[model samples]
Target: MLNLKVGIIGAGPSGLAMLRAFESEQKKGNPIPEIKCYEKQDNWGGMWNYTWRTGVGKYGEPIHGSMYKYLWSNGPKECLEFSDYTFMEHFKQPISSYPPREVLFDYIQGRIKQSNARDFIKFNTVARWVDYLEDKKQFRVIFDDLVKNETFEEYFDYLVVGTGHFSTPNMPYFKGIDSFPGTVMHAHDFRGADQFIDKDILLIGSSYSAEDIGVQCFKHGSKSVTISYRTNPIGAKWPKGIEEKPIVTHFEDNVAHFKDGSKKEYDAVILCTGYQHKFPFLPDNLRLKTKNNLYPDNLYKGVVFNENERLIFLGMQDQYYTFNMFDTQAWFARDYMLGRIALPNKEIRDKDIAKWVELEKTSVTGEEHVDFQTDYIKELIEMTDYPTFDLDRVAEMFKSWLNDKETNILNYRDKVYTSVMTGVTAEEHHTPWMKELDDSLERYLD
Candidate 1:
């Protein structure tokens, strides 16, 4: 009999988790609020949903999805499996430790379906604007129905911004980049590696996207992959056809000039240049303005907005833990919205956030990043009734996964680990990752 209405922006994993969180409470005989989730895409799965359509979506909105075709989960599946719904429970069998994008997407969708949360979502509806109605103590959310070509506004007692941080490409300028003779695109627009076959490819940035995409191009018969890093290389033990270079100085014709005065001709350039936390729909006062970090300021528990506690943001971190972290966050947000958990005063919340932000500044090593995120997740898990698992063990697995990647960058997918939730060890894939190119759900499950 709760009269509060909640508005969730984006129907991705975070948004779906919010819906599932309230639905789970309803099953426990707790009164649930009215929920409406608006998603720009015609379906769920967010970035997990692959699209051949790049640049603009069908409704002329900038495409929000960032996944490419034939992409597999870069990390181990065991590390990200939901505590409430184990992979073994979902698939009815132990799949590989590393699954392709489609398998993981299906698994994400499976949980929401179980909770009967699909009815709460409004597909192809883009949240165009949001403002707090100070007089009413509610939020005025303006949205557009992409499918219907209609714009409307609604008011809600609470607002949850789950519209992920990976959609907007943070493209930097290198001299003469505009006139590069061949194809130049961000990792956001990269859909297929087949286009790179027999051609030399140059990638900028040394993070996960660069590492995975470089290797993928090499695996798909690229002549060579030259990855240029601004600071430090990923330091993977690269295979024959891949190598790292310093930051690019400029691009002359099809040749890329490096900082060390080395130049190489390339057929195409891919900027694995990371993403921005762009929320144009949100007003300046309500927007969460921060780069990708372990702990963003202006969030009390990395979920509730510091300025306005009623506004919540989910899954807005430089991720290590994905699905389960969002679940814990969603559950925590649900409890706050349900008035089960009371937030501290603004001064206390700011001090708490300041402590974490200061700690984040000292976290330099990859191991430290893992530890930082683990602590963050643990903090959220402890605050709510979310099903908890061994985050410490997950931290160990993450370190192990990193070691595996460094040891054999090409064969890390072959490595397996046991899940902390179900204590079930993941089985090896039937085919080697390099040899198995078919990334479809049907093919992977087989």
Candidate 2:
């Protein structure tokens, strides 16, 4: 009899991967544990499930989605292709290298649907608290059914947190930000670009959000995009009407004062300042506290919690490899939970974590970071029965993709590469990203 019960939080890509992992095991005629997935949203796909509403959602909970309208896959689709299901298998044809958000979300949902994994998920359920009982040696998970407005508790032998890290916006306060008359909002609240038509937009932060949103505004007819950077600019060869500047000193009304003493009047301000590692559901001791990083400490293999082996986290990193990495982590976690893989003693695990954490402190260059994550994923792959692919080639593709962006930020999306998993090359898009106004799935697939 399958006596073990596993409770998973968040039905995003990570959670879905966990389900798929156990399902694959079951297909092999192996005994599997009972699984229950809780998702705050009414549907699956987590952040990929876009909503026009921002700030708070319908259930009075902080909105868990952060995708903006007209958003395209920032990286090559090749980098994130699932090993278990190839894009050609899902779409039945070659798609563009850079698909729109809706298309990507469709691909994510399609695979899980085929696996028949959606049945285990409890929709509109919010995980409120998690407590580990020493005597019982099990986790007590308290969750609220948003639809039914009732709270219930369940006990699980293992708890896996697949709740993603990008939902909550880390809005840092700038002097005089409140006095700004124009729109002052975070990238989390940004939905459509039409609102910024013919308006000069000031984007704070030079990361992915800043780069993509700024270009999106320009494509949708914004007057100009001025990006403000804290440490270093993204250094992309930005097209005309898009420029980068030093960090803002303060904001006076609608005017932004920079550290360089330069002043620019803006119609709107978008804080692309990234997100916080927030797990309000878990107590302070159980929560993993660290900024977005490659190798988060306390995790023996970046999946098992040092404090408690029964607790696991997925997709908690400053990521370059997204979907596939989650799959490897999920498979590893599944094996550990099923008694197929045994974790080392606490002292040995702490030593291993410290070694990786120390190495991360020195791996500062972008190239080194790519290699670091590649090695990390490779380690996870070796420890589990997950399907393996040419991750080395994928790492090279990532480096090349970064160089392509540096070569021409405007035309990077125009480039295509071969998938490491399928050996199928991605076709160039029918329309250049700057000219493509329609981000619909039908438009993309057509």
Cα lDDT over the full model 1: 0.90
Q: List per-candidate RMSD values in Å.
A: 1.1, 1.1
User: For each candidate, what is the lDDT?
Assistant: 0.90, 0.90
Residue 405 lDDT (model 1): 90
lDDT of 1 at 130: 83
lDDT of 1 by residue, 120-234 (tens): 8899899998888899999999999988889999999999999999999999989999879899999999998999999999999999899999999999899999999999988
Candidate 1 TM-score to native: 0.98
Per residue, candidate 2 scores C-alpha lDDT tens digits across 317-401 of 7899988898899999988988889888988899999999998888988789999999999998998888889999999989998
